């Protein structure tokens, strides 16, 4: 058997159960699509945007342009821009909900509280907001200000970008005309540009993609993550359990899955109530447990300890179907992507109950719809617990055979800029010195999804990471790719043994792993805070630093909006598999060859871990040479 | 070469010039695309939204679902929703600019004024705004209120929908859960829903499309059109010259082209200054003239007279390339779609200068970029005039041979709800009387683009309109399909004699044409005002009225968002060519067969003018029978 599966043994074991049970699954669905792949679509040179189409670029038959007159470069970049409107929209949606959650929390309407009050007041001071009165007054003002940043138009100056972006970058952005409006206007402008017979200029469309990336980081991501820190605490390093062996079939098991952590936190709070533990015991369970899945799970493991109630992180999105095949899940509560749309029949077979907790998430076979509102989350969480108790009794316990793989790995989660500074003794200077001395050649932000396109689940990501650390490159990781490295064991102290001589020495001295878990793809803005701090300490631009970004198994456009940001931010940005652009030669030249003279960044490509790592190291060494280190 | 050109002789004559000059053009580019059309994309059963793709549904080879698990129905409806985010974004963009233009006008920083003060105060009263102070003060309050409608979230009640929608519709919408947020939030939510592994439920995606259509009409279109009336007057019927014979090569000819009329109005005002006419004459021209193209042109002909400076409307978007081939254009000033992206080589061959006046519009070979801001529009208009004088002197005069077809048609433009009531003597009741009597069987809103997919330019639109009026169906027209009917002579008093027995009789008595020019696709909201007036007068729901909508040569998603609106509004909605959904059998059943029991509306299909007209008339007659008429 030649099926492309996973690098993880636990997933491979569970794939065997899905196959034995004759259930459809991503791994098996890949090859039928392989058999009929469209080469025009693979290369970005098809278009379906209007009724004169569908169109294809084929010069042999005189189809050099679409009916409307657009060329291959415009066609490919326009569809890229459109798909990235979707990515920006998800981050904007999440930010808005975070800000309404903070406001409603301050008004007393949620089960949450103001946890990191120091961050609240420091952020309010940095943004020149009134800090008089009660903390709850300050939190309302901050929420309203951050909503204003979402809504601000292209002609109203932002404050977040001024506080959180370095001047040398801001100067480049002003020169290029890519200082963004708020993300709601920028995503509306980008979408309008993609309508037929509007923007057909690949350079303009690329520039609009860069603007869109900047609007997403400064106008949505940084604010939402800092607000989530205010609500739930700023992460510090701690030990977490990951992989699918964390499940135990004799407990009531509720799994929260998506990118927004509000329902998951409410569930943990509710499950800690004795009345709910007593319900679980009365139903025949040992107790009631909450688990995190994908990015909502990662948000929680960044800030919360493993305890008797919250048990850790299952894995990334290609683990969801396998997870159901454990026969251990009572409720899967889904808040955003990835919630794959054929989970219904798997939930039926394995005796799990599916609950959507967002109006965004719908697909056949969901059992309950409990759309999130801050003022209702207490009641939503309690309803989910009651559903899970009923499901355990009626569907699963003693009825479904559990087949839980034994694998559990330890990961140190919760790295944040604040945690890095604390490990270094309170300033970034020791890190600068070990980079100057060459103990650490540079650093990579691995900000990534997972996919099957360019290998078994997580194969490229894990092996690239191993090649990078062997070359004395420190990794800061976020996204599904971060979950991969955690499950693969690269985020614990044992992994120091796999790093090169300089990085192993630094890691042992600081007592940190060679891969630092920074959380989600939504934490790209937060990772930029570290890179900005490095540039400022060295008195250089971000494009001058010995760093790079990689999204080596990208899937959806949250990852590519983060890649567009990285390009605007001046960075060498590796992306695999190839985005659908390679049939557009002038667009390829722009992104891979000309952008260094425009933003300083560039796209890099490829899926061979050694070659990709060597190409990243060569970039890092070029930057080092120009710095004289 | 082209197998399909146009029903308009002027366009056919100019196509011959393009072909003899061997310049690329839409007519010729259709044929190569025809040769290689993808059957998957034609049917809506391909997907390019993530890296596990591209995917196709082909059950014969085992590809029943995408890699992610989505089915054909979800796949097709999701791409339809995404494309309609683009449509909604364009209307939202335009509305926001209209509101900022009214506010900046009230503050004294534009060359515009407050023309319809009655409408300003009536709107303010209906929306319960403060009406104290000067008219300018009220205009600022109205502008801010309508911006609030754009921004309103899914959880804050709107006022426009309460004022402008009829009673039973509002009950239906609340029951279905489709009462919308503001269009900015609805379009962001729709886009986020389309990301991989979010919403894969065709019924949910269709419902989201209905909500999005409602948000577009009540949250953007009605406000923007009424604000444009406040700025530039409420249209009343007047005779207008149309078709390409309106050009004269001896004048400096500036053509404005797009959907937003602000630059066009400022150009007309500037061209009336003697300093600019004197400049034109000193350059060797007889004087300086302004002309409207496509929807921006139509907005102006609705509200402005033909005079020595403003000369009328050229035609719809398939006329732009032919227009350049006249060799009579000095500047083509482009503000939105449709600005086809291969005009560059045509402008070069025929001695015209291309100017973009919107940050949305970019494509190769544009000469100048003058992005619109209300406070800069006076300067932008003057710069365009200066560019046009230099272009006439240095590119066109004495260098380019003009070839202007002789064809000029007369059309009565400027019908509005107000003009209809006026024509009836002040009340809608005389129109109800003739409908009840059976002289007018019903009314059709023809809200359409043009395309080459289902015939030569405008063939289906014009012949369908002729067949409808022959069946005693009054037409209210907006969009590129309105421009087609004007050019074909259906909008003047001679066209009365093309109508059937009852409609010709009524039109003769009222001295109106049988096709009433209501403007643009942006005027779908305004057409709903007429249909809502009929529903109220008859005290029946819109789904029970003897009306229908047709978009019979639709192209882009402004038209399909108007169709989704029509469906939500309860109407029989004919669309041709087929939208790309016909390979998704459950989605087809929903839209064509089940929606009558849900919203009251349904999609109808087909491109045969007689069959389409017969099917519309049958629906109208079914409605009539149930009303007792
Ligand atoms: S937008 Fe242009 S390239 Fe795309 S389908 Fe329409 S005519 Fe073809
Ligand atoms: S979203 Fe699903 S159907 Fe579309 S390309 Fe990705 S895997 Fe294929
Ligand atoms: Fe935030 S990273 Fe993109 S793939 Fe779906 S949850 Fe993963
Ligand atoms: Fe407003 S209708 Fe759609 S096609 Fe392009 S201008 Fe026409
Ligand atoms: S599947 Fe239609 S062009 Fe690729």
Numbering used by the authors:
A (entry chain B), B (entry chain A): 1 to 629
From the paper:
Here, we report on the structure and reactivity of such a deviant enzyme, termed CooS‐VCh. Its structure reveals the typical CODH scaffold, but contains an iron‐sulfur‐oxo hybrid‐cluster. Although closely related to true CODHs, CooS‐VCh catalyzes neither CO oxidation, nor CO2 reduction. The active site of CooS‐VCh undergoes a redox‐dependent restructuring between a reduced [4Fe‐3S]‐cluster and an oxidized [4Fe‐2S‐S*‐2O‐2(H2O)]‐cluster.
While the [2Fe‐2S] subsite with Fe2 and Fe3 coordinated by Cys338 and Cys480 hardly changes upon reduction, the two μ2‐oxo atoms and the water molecule disappeared, resulting in a [4Fe‐3S]‐cluster. The S3 atom, before part of a cysteine persulfide, is now embedded in the cluster after a shift of 3.1 Å, becoming a μ3‐ligand for Fe2, Fe3 and Fe4. Fe4, coordinated in the oxidized state by two oxo‐bridges, a sulfur and a water molecule, now relocates to an exo position by a 2.1 Å movement and is coordinated by His259, Glu295 and S3 and Sγ‐Cys521, for which Cys521 undergoes a 120° rotation to complete the tetrahedral coordination of Fe4. Fe1 loses its water ligand upon reduction and adopts a trigonal‐planar coordination with open coordination sites in the reduced state. When the hybrid‐cluster is reduced, it rearranges so that the persulfido sulfur becomes a μ3‐bridging ligand within the cluster. This switch of position for S3 and Sγ‐Cys521 opens the channel, providing access to the hybrid‐cluster cavity (open conformation in Figure 7B).
